[PDB]
Structures are given as structure tokens and as C-alpha cells.
Coordinates of C-alpha atoms in Angstrom, one line a residue:
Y1 CA 16.2 19.7 -17.0
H2 CA 17.9 17.2 -14.7
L3 CA 16.9 18.8 -11.4
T4 CA 18.7 16.0 -9.6
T5 CA 22.0 17.4 -11.0
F6 CA 20.9 20.9 -10.1
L7 CA 20.4 19.9 -6.4
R8 CA 23.6 17.9 -6.5
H9 CA 25.5 21.0 -7.7
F10 CA 23.8 23.2 -5.1
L11 CA 24.6 21.0 -2.2
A12 CA 28.2 20.5 -3.5
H13 CA 28.8 24.2 -3.7
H14 CA 27.0 25.1 -0.4
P15 CA 27.3 22.1 1.8
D16 CA 27.2 24.2 5.0
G17 CA 24.0 26.3 5.1
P18 CA 24.0 30.0 6.0
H19 CA 23.0 31.0 9.5
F20 CA 20.2 33.3 8.4
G21 CA 18.2 31.4 5.8
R22 CA 14.9 30.0 7.3
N23 CA 14.9 27.2 4.8
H24 CA 16.5 23.7 5.2
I25 CA 17.6 21.0 2.9
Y26 CA 18.5 17.3 3.4
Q27 CA 19.8 14.5 1.3
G28 CA 19.8 10.8 2.0
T29 CA 19.8 7.4 0.3
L30 CA 17.5 4.4 0.8
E31 CA 18.4 0.9 -0.4
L32 CA 15.1 -1.0 -0.5
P33 CA 15.6 -4.8 -0.5
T34 CA 13.6 -6.1 -3.5
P35 CA 14.4 -9.7 -4.1
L36 CA 10.9 -10.6 -5.3
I37 CA 10.7 -7.9 -7.9
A38 CA 13.5 -6.4 -10.0
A39 CA 14.6 -3.0 -8.7
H40 CA 14.2 -1.3 -12.2
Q41 CA 10.9 -3.1 -12.8
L42 CA 9.5 -2.2 -9.3
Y43 CA 10.6 1.4 -9.8
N44 CA 8.9 1.6 -13.2
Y45 CA 5.7 0.0 -11.9
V46 CA 5.6 2.4 -8.9
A47 CA 6.1 5.3 -11.4
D48 CA 3.3 4.1 -13.6
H49 CA 1.1 4.0 -10.4
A50 CA 2.5 7.2 -8.8
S51 CA -1.0 8.7 -8.6
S52 CA -2.1 5.6 -6.6
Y53 CA 1.0 6.3 -4.5
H54 CA 0.2 10.0 -4.6
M55 CA 3.6 10.7 -6.3
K56 CA 4.1 12.5 -9.6
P57 CA 6.0 11.0 -12.6
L58 CA 7.9 14.0 -14.0
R59 CA 10.4 13.7 -16.8
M60 CA 14.0 15.0 -16.9
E61 CA 17.2 11.4 -25.5
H62 CA 16.4 9.3 -22.5
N63 CA 14.0 10.9 -20.1
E64 CA 14.6 9.8 -16.5
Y65 CA 11.7 10.0 -14.1
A66 CA 11.5 11.0 -10.5
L67 CA 8.7 10.5 -7.9
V68 CA 7.9 13.7 -6.0
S69 CA 5.6 14.6 -3.2
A70 CA 4.6 17.8 -1.4
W71 CA 2.4 18.8 1.6
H72 CA 2.1 21.6 4.1
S73 CA 3.2 20.9 7.7
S74 CA 4.1 22.5 11.0
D75 CA 6.0 27.3 12.6
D76 CA 4.5 26.8 9.1
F77 CA 6.5 25.1 6.4
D78 CA 6.1 23.7 2.9
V79 CA 7.6 20.2 2.7
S80 CA 8.6 18.5 -0.5
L81 CA 10.4 15.3 -1.5
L82 CA 11.9 14.0 -4.7
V83 CA 13.3 10.5 -5.3
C84 CA 15.4 9.2 -8.1
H85 CA 16.7 5.6 -8.3
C86 CA 20.4 5.4 -9.0
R87 CA 20.6 -7.1 -8.6
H88 CA 17.9 -7.7 -6.0
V89 CA 18.1 -4.3 -4.2
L90 CA 16.6 -1.0 -5.1

């Protein structure tokens, strides 16, 4: 399941945030300048070495891959992060 589309739908339909839910969400985009290495090639290499980067290469008949991370933090919270890459810039 393309969870990126799920979260896009969710934030499109509730782009405000109710005033009672203790949870929070945030979306942003990063354009990494990658002239030395191709953006697709660099993304694929990082995905192949996600464990080295502590990410996780989950799938999504093409199966797109997203790098995810999670960790507890502090008021206690559970913090997570998922990244999907969407000619020398990533």
C-alpha cells in the first residue's frame, strides 16, 4: 500500500488539525544538491545501505521504496519519519 498517498490524502482532507488531539503531523520537502552522484542512483544506494544509515527499505508492478526511522523522545512522544524521493539535485 502506497502509504505516501495515504498521508497525502489525510493531510489534504484535514489540513487544519483538531484542537484536542495530542498528536502532531508535519510535511516538508528537501532538495539535496547531488552533482557528484545521480539523484536516483544516490537514493538507490542509500536505500541498499539503509541499515548502515539506520533507515528501513520498505516496499509500496513497480514497488517504490521509502526510508523510515523511529525513536522515542521527550512529555513523552513517539517520533517517526518517512522519506520518499519524488538532473543533479535530489
